[PDB]
Structure 1
Amino acid sequence: GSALDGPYTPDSSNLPSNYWYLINPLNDGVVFSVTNNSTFWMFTYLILPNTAQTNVTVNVMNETVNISIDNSGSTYRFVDYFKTSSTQSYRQRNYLITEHRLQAYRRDESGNISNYWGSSTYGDLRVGTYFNPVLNAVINLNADFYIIPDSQQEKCTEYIKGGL
């Protein structure tokens, strides 16, 4: 299991815990989403370089929502949004600034989503966790992806930093 396991085609399912799902989206827009329809709704929006700030109305888990996006740099920005009730609107949360079309997600046994936040450029690239349990919720990976055991996290980080 030294070889990078994948790629697998886009899919929605109750993904197993303790794996990093390393997505490699070719386009932009909504690349990841999950909800338990009760306490957590989350998605990630991929924004291309040189994107003037604007509002877009997009499909998130078959609901249309209006969000502000921007990318004033020359690299990719993966931006997370979440909310914790059906009546709330989404809030922009963490983001990954990266020269690679790569982000990764892990759901731990407590049901929490982790992914990569910050950037190599600013020296704060880190695994962050949303302490918002959603065990057994359907995860949408809207991208080709690879599967890395989370005992091999440093290998995932190396891909996030340097590409495939």
Structure 2
Amino acid sequence: LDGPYTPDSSNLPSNYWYLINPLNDGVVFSVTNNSTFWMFTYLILPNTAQTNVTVNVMNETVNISIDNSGSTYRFVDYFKTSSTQSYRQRNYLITEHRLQAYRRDESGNISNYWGSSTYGDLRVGTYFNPVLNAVINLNADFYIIPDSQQEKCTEYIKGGL
């Protein structure tokens, strides 16, 4: 819709969907308030055997295991809620397209798509962990779709550009 825009980090406005279309796998999204929420999304390519990988995200070194082995992409969310904690895997998106999208509401809650494009179980999920006014890192090219057109965003997630 509006875009494409190059990767960027900033205090993104609320009530917009940022539809990311990543050139690269790995970390494509991240945000933290450095207090009670750290979140990133890792893009796993198709046919990825089980691998332990080390990434640098928001000034921390992180070790995670990734597995796909499917024909489809997997966008996997990770989060932790205290500094000394390790990140744990949470929800994920299985999809034949290089698309995931993020929205922050007026309370600071991050939403993104969970489930799949393939299986008929696509959901708008929310992590009820406010990070209002935190910088959001979009490590991907992206489009911007207003909340009023949320239905259109879902169509791209499910169907591709």
Q: Runs of 5+ in structure 1 lacking a partner?
A: none
Q: Quick one: distance in 2 between partners of 1:141 and 1:155?
A: 20
Describe the SS at the equivalent of 2:50.
Answer: strand
Q: How does 1:50-129 map to 2 (within 5 A)?
A: 50-129=47-126
Q: Runs of 5+ in structure 2 lacking a partner?
A: none
Q: Report the TM-score, using the length of structure 1 for normalisation.
A: 0.97
1:10 aligns with 2:7: yes
- Deviation of residue 122 (structure 1)? 2.1
- Deviation of residue 59 (structure 1)? 1.1
Q: Is the 8 A contact 2:43 2:74 kept in 1?
A: yes
Q: Hey, which bits of structure 1, 4+ residues long, moved more than 4 A?
A: none
Matched with 2:31 is 34
Deviation string, structure 1 residues 40-61 (Cα, Å, up to 9, x no partner):
0000000000101110001111
- Deviation of residue 27 (structure 1)? 1.5
Q: Quick one: distance in 2 between partners of 1:59 and 1:102?
A: 22
Q: Is the 8 A contact 2:117 2:159 kept in 1?
A: no
Q: Is the 8 A contact 2:95 2:116 kept in 1?
A: yes
Deviation string, structure 1 residues 99-138 (Cα, Å, up to 9, x no partner):
0000000000010000000013222111000000000000
**Overall identity of the aligned pairs, in %:** 100
Matched with 1:146 is 143
Q: Report the TM-score, using the length of structure 2 for normalisation.
A: 0.98
- Deviation of residue 28 (structure 1)? 0.2
Q: Is the 8 A contact 2:53 2:64 kept in 1?
A: yes
- Deviation of residue 141 (structure 1)? 0.2
* Cα RMSD (Å): 0.6
Q: Quick one: distance in 2 between partners of 1:71 and 1:90?
A: 19
Q: Is the 8 A contact 2:38 2:80 kept in 1?
A: yes
Describe the SS at the equivalent of 1:58.
Answer: strand
Q: Quick one: distance in 2 between partners of 1:132 and 1:59?
A: 22
Describe the SS at the equivalent of 1:51.
Answer: coil
